Amino acid sequence: SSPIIKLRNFNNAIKYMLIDKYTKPGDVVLELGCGKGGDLRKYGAAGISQFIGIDISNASIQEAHKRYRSMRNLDYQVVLITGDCFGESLGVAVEPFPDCRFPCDIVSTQFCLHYAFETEEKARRALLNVAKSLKIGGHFFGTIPDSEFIRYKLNKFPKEVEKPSWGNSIYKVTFENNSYQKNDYEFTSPYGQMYTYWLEDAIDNVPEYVVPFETLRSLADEYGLELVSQMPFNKFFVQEIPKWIERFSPKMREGLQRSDGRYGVEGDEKEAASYFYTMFAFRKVKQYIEPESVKP
Ligand SMILES: Nc1ncnc2c1ncn2[C@@H]1O[C@H](CSCC[C@H](N)C(=O)O)[C@@H](O)[C@H]1O
């Protein structure tokens, strides 16, 4: 109905499309930054065997527990853990939860990996956490702001603007500084490139960090993860929607359909959801061995 509701419907559609594209029956899923568990139920149709949700917010995990408790137990085991997925090794978080079945098949980071790019140390710790958790042949997928859209918008500001900002009725980005423009329209470093993000009734002016996708790809490769797909939300939706029209309920279709009959978003939610964000998927191709770790 409202632009922000259509954004939420669209992003939920994206997550269904992403999860069901790469997740297989029987998979063990590690959901990092799982929040209140809003995607827990999206794995049911995929037929997974175990969902491990980790989030740094104990309040969100408590709410995840409460929402799961009122649910009848699904066909998969659910493990919900309060823990820092980006600034600490995952072993600390999951050690009290021996039911976790590692190595897993899927690592999912939905709308959260960009918080790991606060520093190189945190970005590397997050990606090592992802890589070490996975089987060879496992997949790492997720959703982050598209650095190429961010660069496109940043490139429009003259160097004199001290705090480049843009948005529309439902979102706003405010960069901490103009170092990008002063640096001939390139980030001075891949990490800690901070902007405050506002999303109506979702994110209340919280700092987050650009994820220059070439750096995410380079780091992933260093830790044994090969890019399978990276697509802005609008192009991913176009690619997947032909197989999903029949799967969505009537109300779900109605909440995704435009007046010209196509499915997707228009208006302010078009930029806020379908341009601002990209999906990605990596496959683990080799086991990372820490440099100089093999001793006599
Ligand atoms: N270092 C960190 N470790 C784990 N979770 C983190 C984190 N930094 C941020 N988060 C979590 O990232 C989440 C972003 S909100 C997205 C929640 C969920 N993945 C969904 O798509 O609905 C929040 O729950 C926040 O607490």
Residue numbers in the entry: 140 to 435
Authors' description from the paper:
The essential enzyme messenger RNA (mRNA) (guanine-N7) methyltransferase catalyzes S-adenosylmethionine (SAM)-dependent conversion of GpppRNA ends to the m7GpppRNA cap structure characteristic of eukaryal mRNAs. The antibiotic sinefungin (SFG) is a SAM analog in which the S-CH3 sulfonium moiety of SAM is replaced by a C-NH2 amine. Available evidence indicates that the antifungal activity of SFG is exerted via inhibition of fungal cap methyltransferase Abd1. Crystal structures of K. lactis and S. cerevisiae Abd1 as binary complexes with SAH or SFG and ternary complexes with GTP•SFG highlight how SFG makes two hydrogen bonds from its C-NH2 amine to the guanine-O6 and -N7 atoms of GTP that account for its higher affinity vis-à-vis SAH and SAM.
We co-crystallized ScAbd1Δ140 with 0.7 mM SAH and determined the structure using KlAbd1Δ137•SAH as a search model. The final model was refined at 1.75 Å resolution with Rwork/Rfree of 16.4/18.6. The asymmetric unit contained one ScAbd1Δ140 protomer. Electron density for SAH was observed in the methyl acceptor site. ScAbd1Δ140 shares 83% sequence identity with KlAbd1Δ137. The two structures are superimposable with an r.m.s.d. of 1.1 Å over 289 Cα positions. All the atomic interactions of ScAbd1 with SAH recapitulate the interactions observed in the methyl donor site of the KlAbd1•SAH complex. The C-terminal 10-aa segment of ScAbd1 (aa 427–436), which is dispensable for activity and which is absent in KlAbd1, adopts a random coil conformation and projects away from the core methyltransferase domain.
